[PDB]
Amino acid sequence: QFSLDQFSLKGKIALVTGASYGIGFAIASAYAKAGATIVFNDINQELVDRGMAAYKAAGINAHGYVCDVTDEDGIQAMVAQIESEVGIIDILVNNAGIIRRVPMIEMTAAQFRQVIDIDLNAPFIVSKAVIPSMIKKGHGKIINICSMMSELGRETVSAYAAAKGGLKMLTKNIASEYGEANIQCNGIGPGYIATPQTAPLRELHPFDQFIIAKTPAARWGEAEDLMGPAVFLASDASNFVNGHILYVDGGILAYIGKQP
Amino acid sequence: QFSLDQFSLKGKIALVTGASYGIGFAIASAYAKAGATIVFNDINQELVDRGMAAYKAAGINAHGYVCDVTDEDGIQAMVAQIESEVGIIDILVNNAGIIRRVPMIEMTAAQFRQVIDIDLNAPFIVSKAVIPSMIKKGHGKIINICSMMSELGRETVSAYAAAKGGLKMLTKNIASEYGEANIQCNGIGPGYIATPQTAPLRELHPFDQFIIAKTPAARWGEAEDLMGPAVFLASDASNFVNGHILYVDGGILAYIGKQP
Amino acid sequence: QFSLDQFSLKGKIALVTGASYGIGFAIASAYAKAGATIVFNDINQELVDRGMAAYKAAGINAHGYVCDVTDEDGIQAMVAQIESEVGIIDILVNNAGIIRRVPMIEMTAAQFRQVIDIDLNAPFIVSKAVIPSMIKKGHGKIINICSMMSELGRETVSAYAAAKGGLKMLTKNIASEYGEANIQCNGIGPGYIATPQTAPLRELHPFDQFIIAKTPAARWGEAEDLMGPAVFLASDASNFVNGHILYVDGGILAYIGKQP
Amino acid sequence: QFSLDQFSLKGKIALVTGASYGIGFAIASAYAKAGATIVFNDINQELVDRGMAAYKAAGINAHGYVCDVTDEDGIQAMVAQIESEVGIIDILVNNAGIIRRVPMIEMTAAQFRQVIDIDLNAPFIVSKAVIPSMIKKGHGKIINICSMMSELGRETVSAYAAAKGGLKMLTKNIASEYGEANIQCNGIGPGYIATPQTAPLRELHPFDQFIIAKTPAARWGEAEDLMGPAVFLASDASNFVNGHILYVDGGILAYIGKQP
Questions:
Q1: What would the CATH number be for the domain defined by B1-260?
Q2: Cβ atoms A230, A31 nearer than 8 A
Q3: Beta partners for residue B145, in sequence order
């Protein structure tokens, strides 16, 4: 018999990378509310302290670690520390990332490479670090935060689009290579999500008009819109969903757009 | 605050077309277990009686109706009857369909047209019949049962593939046209699902070997694998998922295949 | 050794359905210029006479036939007539189609069905009618005119989107079922193409602004933009391209759009 | 009036990276036969000498340069040298690449990063180096050699799949960012192509059986199958094709497979 318990993360441990604020924090918060124990990392103590205080305020006892996602030795040590202090990571969400907006021909090789390293190579490093214990546990979930840029390009975001396109295919590869070992690796592809940074574009705006017209749902998304889909992909309720990119965009990728 | 209640269908009414047995019955059963009131139709009383007895045995008081999905007048009358006797349909699953396996050049125009009428035109008819009350209710869900044939072709299944390809795009269109009115229209694309009919292909088999090799998960799917994804798409937990085809295939569509 | 002769259609016969004017006429004209003998059909003598006069003015001796693409008996007889009078059809372009713009819930079941019959069932009928002689000839090409609506939905075009989505999958199915017999079946998916009908939307316009912003190439497409891709798919130069939808859209489907 | 001259590369210069042998050499050879002047690079003099001798034997006066594609300074200098000695690069084919086959959890971070650097970062570097002169010339083409791994994953090829997935999206981004400047950036996605290396898998074989069954065309592809599609994408005949991945796979990506 089906049970709604299939969506529950009770007794599972989730690592959400870079989950000190923003989308990662919202996903980790939903995970805790679904029953999970939350672990997270970020690049410095200041960010970790910020995440810890915010989890506490939401009634969550998270476990926070200082670690650079591009540092394999660092991540390996972090996983080992998490396993001794908290337990086996059942669920990994590759959320950490950066974006840069530079015309392609103006972007330095170093800058391009840095975006690739953080947004693509690092999810490989963290996945590699968690998979062996997931196999031994008999079940694992890896959720890669992709983008609409996993599908569509735009001026100024060449490196970001390249890395997210790579992350989409990395997702499908891990699914193929480890699905047999009961690892489900999927993507979440958020639409246009209203963050603190895009707030002036909503001032009582042509950019706001642009987004609303592109979106059948006729609104910006919010971090809260990602919570249900994220919990779904982390849960037993999605055990036969594998190598799939779940777009959460209010219908953008399905829509030609609202024409005048 | 996120809550697992977002996955609950409590107090909602779901119509699952052709849900007397098989995949539709399994989805409707999960819906009931998630809190929904179940209504379903099929082409004759014998099938309806079969579904009713099976729902009863599972502790579900379903409401069953005799109706041909290709009969617009019939479906319109059925919805009106459902609304007077049960209530407003919150969730429609377009599950009813047929398959034929005929080499294309050997298939009659009439046979091709019949597969198109049932598998494509009928989901349009039923969607059209439920959408006006969903808009007035302030929320609706339409879940279209697609296929891997919404993506990939195969000898002998030209009509079926054409209709399911159409259903994929119908899904994206409804999402675009009605998303503004808070209708989420999505697809479920099952992988290779083990039905009563494919049982001899699992006899202690080259076809069995074929499927397992194509599937990262290394097994046939089962109707039970569709239950969580179906409940997800019918629930508040997927409100910003729209015009999306959710493939539930253990990783098939993501995999090049297991080579020797 | 590769030769540019691989793009030549010299000594081949092409049937382009509904090619009396518009996109089909432009494709057929390019085919003739590439060396092909052109045959075409349309629903009445007036349209056939129009196409014939226009081919003549362009220095092309086309062969025109009155036939409804939804009439299997009619199409069968037409192919037989073409084979006796002109020769074996080497290349079929399924170009004939209609579009309707009606809100979905307002569209009659009859109207929806008519769009499906012409835009989806008819390409099946014509393909079926030409394939047996292509197999016997040792090579065939079928080019299905799809749309951006084979990928993306829009208010008012539910039936059209459904049929073109179906046509995309029909294309992939024929490729799979007949590729072994050296039939290559592909799609052409035009972007926004400037037709006589959209001319007021280019008056010295917000709709014009909409299109240009969606298109990396920063212009409407023209029928002429389809000529090279169409000749490519009809030629020996694309013999290992099969079940593929070739989008000719200046970059629309690849682009998130020009934001303000 | 359409002309077959639209497929001609007469008076154009093409740079094909790593085109000393294999797929790149075959594409460059077709380009020369289509009228182009051929320039190419490779990592050492031995490979350059090999390519030069092979071009000469085919009646082609190619221009060969020693350069590492991951060396931005090196590539920049190479382009400058090409422009002084040969002329402006009209067409870039990003063909250079490597593949590694290592289980993901066994692959070193350094090895993963090297595959990404060569197969993804390097196409960015070379594209960046050629685009400014293409803009000034008033027309440019960039053709990225992708893979079926731009779409589908497989055990042992995680890094390769990630890089090719990235290259697919880089292609779409360049299309979006530079399409306005009359740059068409597209992909070629070869299917299973019979190379010297896979020859024992064709010995009079289960792997051979695997490929043939996956392929509607019922054969391995050959480098020659890529020549027409490559010339197409480099030519005026594809000017409104942009951000598109042209799969040349005999129908593989369209096919569910030949079941027993």
A1: 3.40.50.720
A2: yes
A3: B188
Do the chains contact at D154 and A176, CB–CB below 8 Å?
Answer: yes
Reduced to 3 states, what is the DSSP secondary structure of residue C124? Answer: helix
What is the SS3 assignment for D246? strand
Q: Could you tell me if C140 lies within 8 Å of chain B, comparing CB atoms? A: no
Q: How was this entry determined? A: X-ray
8 Å CB contact between C1 and D33? yes
Q: Exposed, middle or buried, C121 (CB in 10 Å: 0-12/13-18/19+)? A: buried
Q: Tell me the residue ranges of DSSP E strands in chain D.
A: 13-17, 37-42, 63-66, 91-94, 140-145, 183-190, 245-248
Residue with tokens 């798409």: B233
Residues of C in contact with B147 (CB under 8 A): none
Sheet with D245-248: strands ordered across:
D63-66, D37-42, D13-17, D91-94, D140-145, D183-190, D245-248
B47 neighbors B95 (Cβ within 8 angstroms): no
C243 contacts D253? CB cut-off 8 A: yes
Q: Which of C160, C178, C192, C247 is catalytic?
A: C160
Place of tokens 């777009």: A247
Query: What does this entry list as its resolution, in Å?
Result: 2.0
Q: Which of C143, A82, A146, C124 is nearest to D162 (CA)?
A: A146
Q: How far apart are the first and last CA of chain A?
A: 50
Pairwise CA distance, residues A32 & A63, whole Å: 12
Show the tokens assigned to C85. Answer: 């009078």
Parse chain B into domains and list their residue ranges. Answer: 1-260
**A to C CB pairs, distance under 8 Å:** 43
3-state helix, strand, coil in chain C (%, to 5): 50, 15, 30
| Chain C residues within 8 A of A154 when measuring between CB atoms | 255-257, 259
Chain B residues inside the 8 Å CB shell of C164:
169
* Residue of chain B whose alpha carbon sits nearest to that of D157: B256
CB within 8 Å: D257 and B210:
yes
In this complex, the residue of D154, D206, D255 whose CB is nearest that of residue B152 is: D255
User: Chain C neighbours among D 50-89 (CB < 8 Å)?
Assistant: 58
